[PDB]
Amino acid sequence: KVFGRCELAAAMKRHGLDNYRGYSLGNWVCAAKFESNFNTQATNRNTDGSTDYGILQINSRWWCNDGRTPGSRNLCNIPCSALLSSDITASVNCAKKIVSDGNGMNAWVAWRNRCKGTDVQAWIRGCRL
Ligand SMILES: [Cl-]
Ligand SMILES: [Cl-]
Ligand SMILES: [Cl-]
Ligand SMILES: [Cl-]
Ligand SMILES: [Cl-]
Ligand SMILES: [Cl-]
Ligand SMILES: [Cl-]
Ligand code: NA
Numbered sequence: 001k002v003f004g005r006c007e008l009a010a011a012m013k014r015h016g017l018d019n020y021r022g023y024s025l026g027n028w029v030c031a032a033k034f035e036s037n038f039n040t041q042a043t044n045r046n047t048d049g050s051t052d053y054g055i056l057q058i059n060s061r062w063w064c065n066d067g068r069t070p071g072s073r074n075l076c077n078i079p080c081s082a083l084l085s086s087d088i089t090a091s092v093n094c095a096k097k098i099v100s101d102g103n104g105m106n107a108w109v110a111w112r113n114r115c116k117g118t119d120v121q122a123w124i125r126g127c128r129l
Helices: 005-014 025-036 080-084 089-099 109-114 120-124
Strands: 043-045 051-053
Touching: 005 025, 005 120, 025 109, 025 120, 051 080, 080 089
Parallel strands: none
Antiparallel strands: 043 051
């Protein structure tokens, strides 16, 4: 599924991400924009052989099982395929674990490089929320 901007803002808010760990909804929308372009089926293979999955490009090294990332963990206790669903519940629940891990949203390199410190409220401007 390719979400619209305001459509994803609303889904993220419905699933409790707005101000989760102190990060406003615009931070989450921005991260999703640059990680996936709002596409649930986004995948990206890393040089280390791990894969990133879904709207927030969650990595198989720690967070999900894909059976092809040697030495990895599955801390969200999900198949990485669950992160590609039209239903963002698994992505959101797993994102709450990641952002709790100690480094906040710096876990998402694209958030650090493209969202952090910017006017992220622009990402939810105009949306009925
Ligand atoms: Cl957009
Ligand atoms: Cl915001
Ligand atoms: Cl594996
Ligand atoms: Cl594990
Ligand atoms: Cl699995
Ligand atoms: Cl959803
Ligand atoms: Cl933080
Ligand atoms: Na894994």
